[PDB]
PDB file of all heavy atoms in Angstrom:
ATOM      1  N   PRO A   1     -63.060 -28.886 -31.963  1.00  0.00           N
ATOM      2  CA  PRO A   1     -63.455 -29.045 -30.534  1.00  0.00           C
ATOM      3  C   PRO A   1     -64.009 -27.722 -30.001  1.00  0.00           C
ATOM      4  O   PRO A   1     -63.333 -26.712 -29.982  1.00  0.00           O
ATOM      5  CB  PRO A   1     -62.151 -29.414 -29.830  1.00  0.00           C
ATOM      6  CG  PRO A   1     -61.075 -28.859 -30.690  1.00  0.00           C
ATOM      7  CD  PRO A   1     -61.589 -28.898 -32.103  1.00  0.00           C
ATOM      8  N   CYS A   2     -65.242 -27.721 -29.555  1.00  0.00           N
ATOM      9  CA  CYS A   2     -65.837 -26.476 -29.028  1.00  0.00           C
ATOM     10  C   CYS A   2     -65.395 -26.231 -27.583  1.00  0.00           C
ATOM     11  O   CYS A   2     -64.291 -26.551 -27.202  1.00  0.00           O
ATOM     12  CB  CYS A   2     -67.359 -26.681 -29.118  1.00  0.00           C
ATOM     13  SG  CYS A   2     -67.934 -27.727 -27.744  1.00  0.00           S
ATOM     14  N   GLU A   3     -66.251 -25.664 -26.789  1.00  0.00           N
ATOM     15  CA  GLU A   3     -65.900 -25.385 -25.369  1.00  0.00           C
ATOM     16  C   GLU A   3     -65.358 -26.636 -24.683  1.00  0.00           C
ATOM     17  O   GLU A   3     -64.237 -26.678 -24.219  1.00  0.00           O
ATOM     18  CB  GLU A   3     -67.218 -25.001 -24.710  1.00  0.00           C
ATOM     19  CG  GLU A   3     -66.961 -23.960 -23.616  1.00  0.00           C
ATOM     20  CD  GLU A   3     -67.271 -24.577 -22.247  1.00  0.00           C
ATOM     21  OE1 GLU A   3     -68.428 -24.920 -22.023  1.00  0.00           O
ATOM     22  OE2 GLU A   3     -66.357 -24.700 -21.451  1.00  0.00           O
ATOM     23  N   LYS A   4     -66.190 -27.622 -24.567  1.00  0.00           N
ATOM     24  CA  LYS A   4     -65.793 -28.867 -23.871  1.00  0.00           C
ATOM     25  C   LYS A   4     -65.283 -29.948 -24.834  1.00  0.00           C
ATOM     26  O   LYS A   4     -65.602 -31.111 -24.700  1.00  0.00           O
ATOM     27  CB  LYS A   4     -67.109 -29.299 -23.225  1.00  0.00           C
ATOM     28  CG  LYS A   4     -67.029 -29.084 -21.716  1.00  0.00           C
ATOM     29  CD  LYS A   4     -68.105 -29.915 -21.019  1.00  0.00           C
ATOM     30  CE  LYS A   4     -67.814 -31.408 -21.252  1.00  0.00           C
ATOM     31  NZ  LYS A   4     -68.687 -32.116 -20.267  1.00  0.00           N
ATOM     32  N   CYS A   5     -64.470 -29.582 -25.785  1.00  0.00           N
ATOM     33  CA  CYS A   5     -63.934 -30.618 -26.726  1.00  0.00           C
ATOM     34  C   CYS A   5     -62.449 -30.376 -27.007  1.00  0.00           C
ATOM     35  O   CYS A   5     -61.835 -31.110 -27.753  1.00  0.00           O
ATOM     36  CB  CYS A   5     -64.759 -30.486 -28.004  1.00  0.00           C
ATOM     37  SG  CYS A   5     -66.248 -31.498 -27.838  1.00  0.00           S
ATOM     38  N   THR A   6     -61.865 -29.384 -26.407  1.00  0.00           N
ATOM     39  CA  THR A   6     -60.410 -29.135 -26.636  1.00  0.00           C
ATOM     40  C   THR A   6     -59.600 -30.119 -25.796  1.00  0.00           C
ATOM     41  O   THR A   6     -58.747 -29.746 -25.023  1.00  0.00           O
ATOM     42  CB  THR A   6     -60.167 -27.698 -26.170  1.00  0.00           C
ATOM     43  OG1 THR A   6     -60.383 -27.622 -24.762  1.00  0.00           O
ATOM     44  CG2 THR A   6     -61.133 -26.749 -26.885  1.00  0.00           C
ATOM     45  N   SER A   7     -59.887 -31.395 -25.932  1.00  0.00           N
ATOM     46  CA  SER A   7     -59.156 -32.415 -25.135  1.00  0.00           C
ATOM     47  C   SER A   7     -59.782 -33.797 -25.354  1.00  0.00           C
ATOM     48  O   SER A   7     -59.356 -34.556 -26.200  1.00  0.00           O
ATOM     49  CB  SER A   7     -59.356 -31.977 -23.688  1.00  0.00           C
ATOM     50  OG  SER A   7     -59.075 -33.056 -22.814  1.00  0.00           O
ATOM     51  N   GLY A   8     -60.799 -34.114 -24.599  1.00  0.00           N
ATOM     52  CA  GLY A   8     -61.464 -35.431 -24.761  1.00  0.00           C
ATOM     53  C   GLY A   8     -62.980 -35.244 -24.574  1.00  0.00           C
ATOM     54  O   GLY A   8     -63.427 -34.621 -23.641  1.00  0.00           O
ATOM     55  N   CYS A   9     -63.766 -35.768 -25.476  1.00  0.00           N
ATOM     56  CA  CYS A   9     -65.240 -35.595 -25.352  1.00  0.00           C
ATOM     57  C   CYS A   9     -65.958 -36.945 -25.422  1.00  0.00           C
ATOM     58  O   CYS A   9     -65.572 -37.828 -26.168  1.00  0.00           O
ATOM     59  CB  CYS A   9     -65.640 -34.719 -26.530  1.00  0.00           C
ATOM     60  SG  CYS A   9     -64.894 -35.373 -28.053  1.00  0.00           S
ATOM     61  N   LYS A  10     -67.005 -37.105 -24.669  1.00  0.00           N
ATOM     62  CA  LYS A  10     -67.758 -38.390 -24.699  1.00  0.00           C
ATOM     63  C   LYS A  10     -68.672 -38.394 -25.923  1.00  0.00           C
ATOM     64  O   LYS A  10     -68.539 -39.234 -26.788  1.00  0.00           O
ATOM     65  CB  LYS A  10     -68.582 -38.396 -23.414  1.00  0.00           C
ATOM     66  CG  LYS A  10     -67.651 -38.626 -22.215  1.00  0.00           C
ATOM     67  CD  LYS A  10     -68.357 -39.516 -21.183  1.00  0.00           C
ATOM     68  CE  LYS A  10     -67.486 -40.739 -20.886  1.00  0.00           C
ATOM     69  NZ  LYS A  10     -66.178 -40.169 -20.438  1.00  0.00           N
ATOM     70  N   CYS A  11     -69.583 -37.450 -25.999  1.00  0.00           N
ATOM     71  CA  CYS A  11     -70.513 -37.377 -27.173  1.00  0.00           C
ATOM     72  C   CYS A  11     -70.819 -38.778 -27.709  1.00  0.00           C
ATOM     73  O   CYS A  11     -70.084 -39.304 -28.514  1.00  0.00           O
ATOM     74  CB  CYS A  11     -69.747 -36.518 -28.188  1.00  0.00           C
ATOM     75  SG  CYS A  11     -69.528 -34.863 -27.473  1.00  0.00           S
ATOM     76  N   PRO A  12     -71.890 -39.329 -27.221  1.00  0.00           N
ATOM     77  CA  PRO A  12     -72.303 -40.696 -27.644  1.00  0.00           C
ATOM     78  C   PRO A  12     -72.865 -40.672 -29.066  1.00  0.00           C
ATOM     79  O   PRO A  12     -72.536 -41.508 -29.881  1.00  0.00           O
ATOM     80  CB  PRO A  12     -73.388 -41.064 -26.633  1.00  0.00           C
ATOM     81  CG  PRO A  12     -73.936 -39.758 -26.164  1.00  0.00           C
ATOM     82  CD  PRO A  12     -72.824 -38.746 -26.242  1.00  0.00           C
ATOM     83  N   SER A  13     -73.696 -39.726 -29.375  1.00  0.00           N
ATOM     84  CA  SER A  13     -74.278 -39.660 -30.743  1.00  0.00           C
ATOM     85  C   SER A  13     -74.673 -38.212 -31.073  1.00  0.00           C
ATOM     86  O   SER A  13     -74.205 -37.632 -32.032  1.00  0.00           O
ATOM     87  CB  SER A  13     -75.510 -40.552 -30.702  1.00  0.00           C
ATOM     88  OG  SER A  13     -75.328 -41.571 -29.719  1.00  0.00           O
ATOM     89  N   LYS A  14     -75.546 -37.630 -30.295  1.00  0.00           N
ATOM     90  CA  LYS A  14     -75.962 -36.233 -30.567  1.00  0.00           C
ATOM     91  C   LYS A  14     -76.651 -35.628 -29.341  1.00  0.00           C
ATOM     92  O   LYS A  14     -76.398 -34.491 -28.973  1.00  0.00           O
ATOM     93  CB  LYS A  14     -76.943 -36.336 -31.733  1.00  0.00           C
ATOM     94  CG  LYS A  14     -76.178 -36.320 -33.054  1.00  0.00           C
ATOM     95  CD  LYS A  14     -77.077 -35.791 -34.163  1.00  0.00           C
ATOM     96  CE  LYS A  14     -76.344 -34.673 -34.924  1.00  0.00           C
ATOM     97  NZ  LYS A  14     -77.428 -33.934 -35.636  1.00  0.00           N
ATOM     98  N   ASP A  15     -77.518 -36.360 -28.703  1.00  0.00           N
ATOM     99  CA  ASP A  15     -78.228 -35.822 -27.506  1.00  0.00           C
ATOM    100  C   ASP A  15     -77.260 -35.054 -26.610  1.00  0.00           C
ATOM    101  O   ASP A  15     -77.588 -34.012 -26.072  1.00  0.00           O
ATOM    102  CB  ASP A  15     -78.772 -37.053 -26.779  1.00  0.00           C
ATOM    103  CG  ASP A  15     -79.826 -36.623 -25.755  1.00  0.00           C
ATOM    104  OD1 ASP A  15     -80.917 -36.277 -26.182  1.00  0.00           O
ATOM    105  OD2 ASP A  15     -79.527 -36.650 -24.580  1.00  0.00           O
ATOM    106  N   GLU A  16     -76.067 -35.547 -26.437  1.00  0.00           N
ATOM    107  CA  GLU A  16     -75.072 -34.844 -25.575  1.00  0.00           C
ATOM    108  C   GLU A  16     -74.071 -34.107 -26.442  1.00  0.00           C
ATOM    109  O   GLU A  16     -73.388 -33.196 -26.010  1.00  0.00           O
ATOM    110  CB  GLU A  16     -74.369 -35.934 -24.766  1.00  0.00           C
ATOM    111  CG  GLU A  16     -75.369 -37.038 -24.398  1.00  0.00           C
ATOM    112  CD  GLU A  16     -76.399 -36.491 -23.404  1.00  0.00           C
ATOM    113  OE1 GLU A  16     -77.338 -35.857 -23.852  1.00  0.00           O
ATOM    114  OE2 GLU A  16     -76.226 -36.717 -22.214  1.00  0.00           O
ATOM    115  N   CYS A  17     -73.969 -34.505 -27.672  1.00  0.00           N
ATOM    116  CA  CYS A  17     -73.004 -33.858 -28.596  1.00  0.00           C
ATOM    117  C   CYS A  17     -73.654 -32.685 -29.328  1.00  0.00           C
ATOM    118  O   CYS A  17     -73.388 -31.533 -29.025  1.00  0.00           O
ATOM    119  CB  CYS A  17     -72.633 -34.981 -29.555  1.00  0.00           C
ATOM    120  SG  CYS A  17     -71.740 -34.316 -30.975  1.00  0.00           S
ATOM    121  N   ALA A  18     -74.512 -32.946 -30.284  1.00  0.00           N
ATOM    122  CA  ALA A  18     -75.163 -31.834 -31.023  1.00  0.00           C
ATOM    123  C   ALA A  18     -75.608 -30.743 -30.047  1.00  0.00           C
ATOM    124  O   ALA A  18     -75.714 -29.583 -30.390  1.00  0.00           O
ATOM    125  CB  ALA A  18     -76.374 -32.470 -31.694  1.00  0.00           C
ATOM    126  N   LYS A  19     -75.855 -31.114 -28.828  1.00  0.00           N
ATOM    127  CA  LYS A  19     -76.283 -30.124 -27.802  1.00  0.00           C
ATOM    128  C   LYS A  19     -75.133 -29.168 -27.477  1.00  0.00           C
ATOM    129  O   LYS A  19     -75.299 -27.963 -27.426  1.00  0.00           O
ATOM    130  CB  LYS A  19     -76.635 -30.973 -26.582  1.00  0.00           C
ATOM    131  CG  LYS A  19     -78.160 -31.076 -26.448  1.00  0.00           C
ATOM    132  CD  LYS A  19     -78.540 -31.119 -24.974  1.00  0.00           C
ATOM    133  CE  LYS A  19     -79.978 -30.646 -24.798  1.00  0.00           C
ATOM    134  NZ  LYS A  19     -79.887 -29.443 -23.931  1.00  0.00           N
ATOM    135  N   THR A  20     -73.968 -29.707 -27.224  1.00  0.00           N
ATOM    136  CA  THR A  20     -72.802 -28.851 -26.887  1.00  0.00           C
ATOM    137  C   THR A  20     -71.944 -28.610 -28.134  1.00  0.00           C
ATOM    138  O   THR A  20     -71.032 -27.793 -28.124  1.00  0.00           O
ATOM    139  CB  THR A  20     -72.026 -29.679 -25.838  1.00  0.00           C
ATOM    140  OG1 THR A  20     -72.580 -29.439 -24.559  1.00  0.00           O
ATOM    141  CG2 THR A  20     -70.546 -29.291 -25.851  1.00  0.00           C
ATOM    142  N   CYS A  21     -72.202 -29.325 -29.181  1.00  0.00           N
ATOM    143  CA  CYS A  21     -71.379 -29.142 -30.423  1.00  0.00           C
ATOM    144  C   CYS A  21     -72.272 -28.844 -31.623  1.00  0.00           C
ATOM    145  O   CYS A  21     -72.731 -29.746 -32.297  1.00  0.00           O
ATOM    146  CB  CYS A  21     -70.653 -30.474 -30.609  1.00  0.00           C
ATOM    147  SG  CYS A  21     -70.082 -31.071 -28.994  1.00  0.00           S
ATOM    148  N   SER A  22     -72.494 -27.595 -31.904  1.00  0.00           N
ATOM    149  CA  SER A  22     -73.336 -27.246 -33.086  1.00  0.00           C
ATOM    150  C   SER A  22     -72.485 -27.388 -34.345  1.00  0.00           C
ATOM    151  O   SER A  22     -72.412 -26.493 -35.166  1.00  0.00           O
ATOM    152  CB  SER A  22     -73.735 -25.790 -32.881  1.00  0.00           C
ATOM    153  OG  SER A  22     -75.051 -25.582 -33.384  1.00  0.00           O
ATOM    154  N   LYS A  23     -71.824 -28.502 -34.488  1.00  0.00           N
ATOM    155  CA  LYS A  23     -70.947 -28.712 -35.663  1.00  0.00           C
ATOM    156  C   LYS A  23     -70.238 -30.054 -35.509  1.00  0.00           C
ATOM    157  O   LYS A  23     -70.436 -30.749 -34.539  1.00  0.00           O
ATOM    158  CB  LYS A  23     -69.947 -27.570 -35.588  1.00  0.00           C
ATOM    159  CG  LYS A  23     -70.304 -26.506 -36.639  1.00  0.00           C
ATOM    160  CD  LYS A  23     -70.320 -25.125 -35.971  1.00  0.00           C
ATOM    161  CE  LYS A  23     -68.883 -24.630 -35.798  1.00  0.00           C
ATOM    162  NZ  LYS A  23     -69.021 -23.294 -35.140  1.00  0.00           N
ATOM    163  N   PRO A  24     -69.430 -30.363 -36.481  1.00  0.00           N
ATOM    164  CA  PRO A  24     -68.683 -31.628 -36.452  1.00  0.00           C
ATOM    165  C   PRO A  24     -67.413 -31.486 -35.616  1.00  0.00           C
ATOM    166  O   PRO A  24     -66.311 -31.681 -36.101  1.00  0.00           O
ATOM    167  CB  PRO A  24     -68.354 -31.872 -37.920  1.00  0.00           C
ATOM    168  CG  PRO A  24     -68.364 -30.507 -38.560  1.00  0.00           C
ATOM    169  CD  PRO A  24     -69.153 -29.572 -37.682  1.00  0.00           C
ATOM    170  N   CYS A  25     -67.546 -31.148 -34.352  1.00  0.00           N
ATOM    171  CA  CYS A  25     -66.326 -31.004 -33.491  1.00  0.00           C
ATOM    172  C   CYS A  25     -65.352 -32.139 -33.780  1.00  0.00           C
ATOM    173  O   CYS A  25     -65.584 -33.283 -33.421  1.00  0.00           O
ATOM    174  CB  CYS A  25     -66.847 -31.054 -32.045  1.00  0.00           C
ATOM    175  SG  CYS A  25     -67.155 -29.370 -31.467  1.00  0.00           S
ATOM    176  N   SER A  26     -64.270 -31.842 -34.438  1.00  0.00           N
ATOM    177  CA  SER A  26     -63.265 -32.895 -34.779  1.00  0.00           C
ATOM    178  C   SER A  26     -62.718 -33.555 -33.514  1.00  0.00           C
ATOM    179  O   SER A  26     -61.584 -33.337 -33.129  1.00  0.00           O
ATOM    180  CB  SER A  26     -62.150 -32.154 -35.527  1.00  0.00           C
ATOM    181  OG  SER A  26     -62.725 -31.146 -36.344  1.00  0.00           O
ATOM    182  N   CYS A  27     -63.508 -34.357 -32.864  1.00  0.00           N
ATOM    183  CA  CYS A  27     -63.031 -35.036 -31.626  1.00  0.00           C
ATOM    184  C   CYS A  27     -64.142 -35.899 -31.020  1.00  0.00           C
ATOM    185  O   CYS A  27     -63.881 -36.863 -30.332  1.00  0.00           O
ATOM    186  CB  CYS A  27     -62.619 -33.924 -30.652  1.00  0.00           C
ATOM    187  SG  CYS A  27     -63.679 -32.469 -30.857  1.00  0.00           S
ATOM    188  N   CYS A  28     -65.385 -35.577 -31.282  1.00  0.00           N
ATOM    189  CA  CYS A  28     -66.474 -36.428 -30.717  1.00  0.00           C
ATOM    190  C   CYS A  28     -66.476 -37.752 -31.515  1.00  0.00           C
ATOM    191  O   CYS A  28     -65.482 -38.074 -32.131  1.00  0.00           O
ATOM    192  CB  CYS A  28     -67.798 -35.674 -30.906  1.00  0.00           C
ATOM    193  SG  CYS A  28     -67.616 -33.864 -30.967  1.00  0.00           S
ATOM    194  N   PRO A  29     -67.556 -38.507 -31.474  1.00  0.00           N
ATOM    195  CA  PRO A  29     -67.582 -39.784 -32.235  1.00  0.00           C
ATOM    196  C   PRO A  29     -67.689 -39.516 -33.739  1.00  0.00           C
ATOM    197  O   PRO A  29     -68.573 -40.026 -34.411  1.00  0.00           O
ATOM    198  CB  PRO A  29     -68.839 -40.479 -31.730  1.00  0.00           C
ATOM    199  CG  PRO A  29     -69.726 -39.382 -31.270  1.00  0.00           C
ATOM    200  CD  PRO A  29     -68.828 -38.272 -30.765  1.00  0.00           C
ATOM    201  N   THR A  30     -66.807 -38.725 -34.277  1.00  0.00           N
ATOM    202  CA  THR A  30     -66.866 -38.434 -35.737  1.00  0.00           C
ATOM    203  C   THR A  30     -65.490 -38.674 -36.375  1.00  0.00           C
ATOM    204  O   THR A  30     -64.723 -39.429 -35.815  1.00  0.00           O
ATOM    205  CB  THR A  30     -67.238 -36.949 -35.831  1.00  0.00           C
ATOM    206  OG1 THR A  30     -66.213 -36.162 -35.232  1.00  0.00           O
ATOM    207  CG2 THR A  30     -68.560 -36.712 -35.091  1.00  0.00           C
TER     208      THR A  30
HETATM  209 CD1   CD B   1     -69.743 -33.513 -29.619  1.00  0.00          CD
HETATM  210 CD1   CD B   2     -67.832 -29.914 -29.049  1.00  0.00          CD
HETATM  211 CD1   CD B   3     -65.609 -33.359 -29.448  1.00  0.00          CD
END
């Protein structure tokens, strides 16, 4: 979980995820 992932993240696919998560943030839709 990066900055905005140490809890709950929406990240639908990448447009909002890959943007704030330059990695497989163990919490987005992965
Ligand atoms: Cd994400
Ligand atoms: Cd993240
Ligand atoms: Cd996440």
